[PDB]
Design a protein around this ligand. Structure first.
Ligand SMILES: Nc1ncnc2c1ncn2[C@@H]1O[C@H](COP(=O)(O)OP(N)(=O)O)[C@@H](O)[C@H]1O
Ligand SMILES: Nc1ncnc2c1ncn2[C@@H]1O[C@H](COP(=O)(O)OP(N)(=O)O)[C@@H](O)[C@H]1O
Lengths: 372, 386
């Protein structure tokens, strides 16, 4: 299995994907792949020997593809295929690199590992809550919510494979569908509460039906009263629950998170401003190379091309400076007033040109070439 | 005036700084400056004909310096100098480029049509979420914006900032008072009021809607065309008998936080993309430089090298494959995307093979990219050693 219909270059993720419970476990596996047309790297998940029962399910998927939230791993497309040798349904998601499952992050062996700092638990709470708000608004339920089902790429938290579980369990013909999405949506909120308690305890089996109440008691000792009420709110099942209702409990923290994100944006704003250089170089040289090969002005650029890479040390040895080439190209891109002296292969001719002028020669030459 | 205290190549920002009213208007100009030691570019404000009275205001300037928030333009230093040709006090801020005042952005007219199509509500909240973020940061540090209004806020791309918060305190600062900072709380309330006017003015997008006479109906304007949350927001700020807090405004913004919190994360996503492509650009620019050194470099590099043979020739053919493509019309087809795909294949050195065709139709040459990379590597090292 090296080819799939709309993709190729598949690579197996680890750990191997868990087999999924429909009624009978359908062995299922998730893969790194590469798009055939663009060469983009995506993530695709195969569930073995599965065919969608009705077309209506397709409507449900369309909702899933349609949804777009930063806190949800994007669903890109879904197709049924026989290429693997067991005809199967594969879902393609965006591939987020170096990500590990939240289970992997925090529950792998103050218990197993130093109990999570409160600060972190809220940042998680805000991301997960945001995703849920987006999902529920979009008239969907996560369906399954638990440590394996959420992935953390760097500091970001994302609902990794939410659509799958909904697809597998869906009824094409359902008595009150919208009434059922309602119970499902609530379930998530109960499941959200169960998750965060596992986090605050940083022991997965704290959530145990038996254990939970003492686990809650622990939470309040080591963490704030707010985090308590939050967790206690999600657990009081009797009442209808909303992502909105959690809002005053997170409370003013939103400003800390909102504020943090802006300085991350300012962080990368600087980085990006520096590394933007690489781009200009790649592009400026690409214009120049295309110009040099294809056929006065053309000769001028060609002499300049010799200036950069045709160099010879007094002896006859080459003089390739990497740094010099970068400087000259940057000056060329800037179109600086400063002038360089070009020498023709003939001894007599010598050319004096401003970079700004030379940049024009390239700019003029390219446009005509594109035009033709 | 081309040299300053720490500063040279000062450039005049437009539109020109508005005069500053303390008692008698002091003409002012704001400048783009380059730091001499650092070469970093800052923004500095000169208010004309001034002398600081005392260290007392300085102790206050220290606090502004301590403070550092994303929604406020940073204060770096304040100094009094006689260089510009008179007595002036100059304040140095971080320079945010291409930024414009909030007044200029939303209130410049081209005509309820107002002067412009009423602002989208979503837009207004994001502004609210950023200004409130600013005051929350500033009060919490025991300060009052002192002046809040369309001119004093600048918008740099999507980012909204308090442009020159510190200036108001030093200019109006007095040697003798009940205390310098005894007054700060009434200032803070004055801010929260001033916030209300700004957002009301934005809703209407008519600047004069703030005026005493007009307000009630301006609020009436808001309620017709916007959410009743925005109504409550503007209205809450206007009750004056009550002591108030920036963080009291929270439930009114309410569920928007996810909305904003989300757009920022998507901005973070977009940058990681951009940041990624730049590194690729990095990888490939360098591959290209190695490619260029070799082609036609081999003028006399080797005596024995025979025409059209082995490594030098194979890389020449590859160069033609990238930059010497003809559209069926016979037009030069330069493919930007194609070139990037090929170089990545060469940089990665993939299993997959490509067909390199001579200018002669007869000659054709099929080579794996991994083999294709090897030629460049071996060709380059041979050249590097000399
Ligand atoms: N959408 C995704 N993009 C990139 N990597 C992903 C991903 N979803 C999951 N992964 C990676 O694969 C591992 C398990 O993912 P997956 O097989 O889909 O979830 P599972 N069956 O273990 O519950 C995780 O450690 C995670 O790093
Ligand atoms: N801190 C700052 N960094 C970069 N640019 C700034 C800035 N403060 C103001 N500007 C720009 O300079 C112009 C005038 O600045 P400013 O002096 O704040 O306006 P003013 N004095 O008439 O009230 C504005 O159009 C604004 O875009």
């Amino acid at each position: 299995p090296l080819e799939v219909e709309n993709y190729h270059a598949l690579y197996p993720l680890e750990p191997p994907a868990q087999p999924l419970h429909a009624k009978l476990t359908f062995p299922a596996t998730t893969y790194r792949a590469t798009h055939n047309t663009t060469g983009y790297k995506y993530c695709l998940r195969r569930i073995h020997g599965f065919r969608l029962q009705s077309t209506k399910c397709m409507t449900l998927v369309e909702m899933w593809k349609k949804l777009q939230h930063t806190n949800v791993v994007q669903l890109r497309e879904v197709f049924t295929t026989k290429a693997f040798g067991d005809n199967s349904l594969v879902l393609v998601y965006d591939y987020h690199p170096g990500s590990q499952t939240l289970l992997a992050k925090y529950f792998t062996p103050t218990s197993n590992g130093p109990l999570l700092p409160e600060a972190t638990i809220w940042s998680i709470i805000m991301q997960l809550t945001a995703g849920l708000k987006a999902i529920h608004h979009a008239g969907l339920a996560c369906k399954v919510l638990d440590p394996t089902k959420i992935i953390v790429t760097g500091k970001r938290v994302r609902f990794s494979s939410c659509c799958i579980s909904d697809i597998t369990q869906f009824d094409p013909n359902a008595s009150n569908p919208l009434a059922l999405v309602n119970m499902h949506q609530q379930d998530d909120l109960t499941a959200l509460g169960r998750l965060v308690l596992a986090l605050a305890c940083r022991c997965l089996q704290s959530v145990q039906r038996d254990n939970v109440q003492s686990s809650i008691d622990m939470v309040t000792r080591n963490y704030s009263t707010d985090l308590r009420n939050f967790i206690v709110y999600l657990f009081t099942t009797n009442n209808r629950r909303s992502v909105t209702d959690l809002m005053p409990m997170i409370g003013a923290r939103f400003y800390t998170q909102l504020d943090a994100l802006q300085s991350k944006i300012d962080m990368q704003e600087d980085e990006l401003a520096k590394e933007m250089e690489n781009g200009r170089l790649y592009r400026i040289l690409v214009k120049l190379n295309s110009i040099n090969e294809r056929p006065g002005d053309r000769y001028m650029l060609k002499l300049f091309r010799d200036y950069l890479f045709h160099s010879v040390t007094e002896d006859g040895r080459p003089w390739l400076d990497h740094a010099h080439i970068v400087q000259c190209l940057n000056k060329l891109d800037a179109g600086s007033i400063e002038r360089v002296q070009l020498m023709s292969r003939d001894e007599q001719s010598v050319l004096i040109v401003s970079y700004a002028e030379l940049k024009n020669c390239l700019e003029n030459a390219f446009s005509e070439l594109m035009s033709s």
